[PDB]
Design an enzyme around this catalytic site. Structure first.
Site, PDB file in Angstrom:
ATOM      1  N   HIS A   1      62.478  19.370  29.863  1.00 18.01           N
ATOM      2  CA  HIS A   1      63.410  19.372  30.991  1.00 18.01           C
ATOM      3  C   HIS A   1      63.090  20.627  31.794  1.00 18.01           C
ATOM      4  CE1 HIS A   1      67.261  19.197  33.235  1.00 18.01           C
ATOM      5  NE2 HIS A   1      67.231  17.922  32.899  1.00 18.01           N
TER       6      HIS A   1
ATOM      7  N   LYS B   1      74.077  18.591  28.767  1.00 18.34           N
ATOM      8  CA  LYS B   1      73.664  19.970  28.993  1.00 18.34           C
ATOM      9  C   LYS B   1      74.632  20.838  28.199  1.00 18.34           C
ATOM     10  CE  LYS B   1      71.426  19.013  33.347  1.00 18.34           C
ATOM     11  NZ  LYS B   1      71.504  19.005  34.834  1.00 18.34           N
TER      12      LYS B   1
ATOM     13  N   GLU C   1      64.870  22.613  33.380  1.00 22.76           N
ATOM     14  CA  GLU C   1      65.772  23.720  33.113  1.00 22.76           C
ATOM     15  C   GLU C   1      65.187  24.615  32.037  1.00 22.76           C
ATOM     16  OE1 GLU C   1      69.692  21.941  32.606  1.00 22.76           O
ATOM     17  OE2 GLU C   1      69.665  21.199  34.664  1.00 22.76           O
TER      18      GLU C   1
ATOM     19  N   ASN D   1      72.673  13.420  29.766  1.00 21.09           N
ATOM     20  CA  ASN D   1      72.330  14.772  29.377  1.00 21.09           C
ATOM     21  C   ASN D   1      73.569  15.589  29.681  1.00 21.09           C
ATOM     22  OD1 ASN D   1      69.774  17.216  30.412  1.00 21.09           O
ATOM     23  ND2 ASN D   1      71.257  17.218  28.740  1.00 21.09           N
TER      24      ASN D   1
ATOM     25  N   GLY E   1      71.211  17.825  40.058  1.00 18.10           N
ATOM     26  CA  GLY E   1      72.514  18.404  40.338  1.00 18.10           C
ATOM     27  C   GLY E   1      72.613  19.023  41.716  1.00 18.10           C
TER      28      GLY E   1
END
Lengths: 251, 251
Positions: free
Chosen positions: A94, A10, A96, A8, A172
């Site tokens: 996700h 991002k 996020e 990913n 992360g």
């Protein structure tokens, strides 16, 4: 259960960077018969990337998509659109997006159904927060998210879905869940699938672990029985690392 | 004030359909200095659209974007990526984004500041709901959205921003506001820009009307002193319909 490892990216590269990445990686990705290698890039680069990955085993996937074929959803991209391009994977739900862009378990479920309807293999994300982990509802949170998302599917389709269990506090953060810990939640998820779809669906579906995975620890995770590969973000931004990760699926 | 006419395809085409549209319209769209002809397409098609539109007075824009250049914002596209691709305009704060994906005036502001610092021309959207309309806050609601969206910019750049007033209830309903009313609101918005950034920028800033503008009602809107063009949605999907609209800008 064939291992699958997805990167990913991002919001991280420029078209050029993006194409150079595929160029570098595509020739050394493990054979498709052994490990499914997928690079989830930003929408703008999907087109060139689908081509650069000409006749390679490097699959291209999107980080989202809408649940409708076409319509008045300014900004969104449809499952029809992505299919037409040659995109095969799509990350769904996700965190996020769940916490930032109002992605409810409802929209996620809509999207998973749409995914199957359009030919895309969905990677459904599910995971608990720190607070939930500490409060003990890990298994419950994960279970509802999985119960709701897979709602409406048939067992034959469920066998083809991919579930990325990602404890939020691990994304992360440098703090990975332990293989043993992750293995249990994954076992739980697989168990939830079995109770909803069956032992065949549950024995086929591939559950992933996501959350600060690194080329130095994929092996540990993949070695666990309930885990079938890792959804990787940060350590997938460099070709080398990515090649390190995807090779962990015992080539 | 040079009239500007932008088309928002929303989630609507396939790469192929997308390229021919540009291929069909580009060489016949009005001369730049007269009318700013713009086509806002899905992220997937921009690469090609930009490429195919190079050299023509037809400008390509995005339907949305994030405020951060880089970031762990799965599914998002950043201003850097856009500029880097050759995209020139970007829509921000579309009601559809606002009421469906958590777009707030704060984030819309951050994005507006981002366009300018990244070299993209924002088409800042604003408008009242049917309710607020009935309650009489059209001038209020609209004024706040503009004051919040422009906060941070200098008069010099406000002069470069495009503000699109769209009464939510007219967006694709078939019902559009009267030119006189739309002109009143656009005027009021201009008063807001004048009061905040001085009369100068207020006279240079271009304000569009959006909300069911058809190729047969655009002239009516453009005629209105305070209305500098239209942000068209549905009527902008057909090359034929689009060229009609943009021509209404020519003269």
């Amino acid at each position: 259960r064939k291992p699958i490892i997805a990167g990913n990216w991002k919001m991280h590269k420029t078209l050029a960077e993006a194409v150079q990445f595929v160029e570098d990686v595509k020739g050394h990705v493990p054979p498709a018969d052994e490990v499914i290698s997928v690079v989830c890039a930003p929408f703008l680069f999907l087109d060139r990337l689908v081509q650069a990955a000409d006749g390679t085993d490097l699959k291209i996937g999107a980080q989202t998509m809408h649940f409708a074929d076409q319509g008045a959803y300014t900004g969104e991209v449809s499952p029809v659109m992505l299919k037409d391009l040659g995109v095969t994977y799509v990350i769904l739900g996700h965190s996020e997006r769940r916490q930032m862009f109002a992605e409810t378990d409802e929209t996620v479920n809509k999207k998973v159904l749409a995914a199957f309807t359009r030919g895309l293999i969905p990677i459904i994300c599910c995971g608990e927060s720190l607070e939930e982990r500490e409060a003990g509802q890990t298994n419950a949170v994960v279970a509802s998210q999985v119960e709701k998302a897979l709602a409406g599917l048939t067992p034959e389709q469920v066998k083809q879905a991919v579930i990325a269990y990602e404890p939020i506090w691990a994304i992360g953060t440098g703090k990975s869940s332990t293989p043993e810990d992750a293995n249990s939640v994954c076992g739980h998820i697989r168990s939830v699938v079995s109770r909803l779809f069956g032992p065949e669906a549950a024995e086929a579906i591939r559950i992933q672990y996501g959350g600060s995975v690194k080329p130095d620890n994929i092996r540990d995770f993949l070695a666990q029985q309930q885990i079938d590969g890792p959804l990787v973000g940060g350590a997938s931004l460099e070709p080398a690392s990515f090649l390190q990760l995807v090779e962990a699926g015992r080539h």
